[PDB]
C-alpha cells in the first residue's frame, strides 16, 4: 500500500470483458470489496489496484467501483 485512493466495489467483475489485449492480469471484484488503487487515470477505463478483500492485484473496469467514503 501507499498514499493512494481507495474504492468500494459496487458491481462484480470476474474477468469479462477481459483487460484489452491481455496487457495485464484481471482483478476479480465482489460487491463490497475495498480496492486500494495502484494505477489510475481519469481518462482511462482500466485501473490497477490491490483488492484488500482478497489481497489480489490486477486490472479491472473503473465502472465497477466508486470512492470508498
Amino acid at each position: 500500500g501507499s498514499h493512494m485512493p481507495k474504492m468500494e466495489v459496487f458491481q462484480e467483475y470476474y474477468g469479462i470483458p477481459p483487460p484489452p489485449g491481455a496487457f495485464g492480469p484481471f482483478l476479480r471484484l465482489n460487491p463490497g470489496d475495498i480496492v486500494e488503487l495502484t494505477k489510475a487515470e481519469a481518462e482511462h477505463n482500466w485501473w490497477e489496484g490491490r483488492n484488500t478483500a482478497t489481497n489480489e492485484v490486477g486490472w479491472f473496469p473503473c465502472n465497477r467501483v466508486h470512492p470508498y467514503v
Binding site: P17, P18, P20, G21, F23, E43
Partner: protein, 56 residues
Amino acid sequence: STYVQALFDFDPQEDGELGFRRGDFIHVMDNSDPNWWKGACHGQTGMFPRNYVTPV
C-alpha cells in the same frame, strides 16, 4: 478481407487504437501481433484488442 465482430465495447486509451461498440463488424487489416491487430471500422483504422472480437 477477413471480418471479426466485437464481443464488447472498447474505447481507445492510447492514440492509434481503434474503438468500437459490441456488435460492430471490423475489417482485419494486420494480424501480426499476438494481442493487438490493425483493423478498420467506422471509417478509421487503428489497433484493436484481439480478445474483444470473434471471427465472422
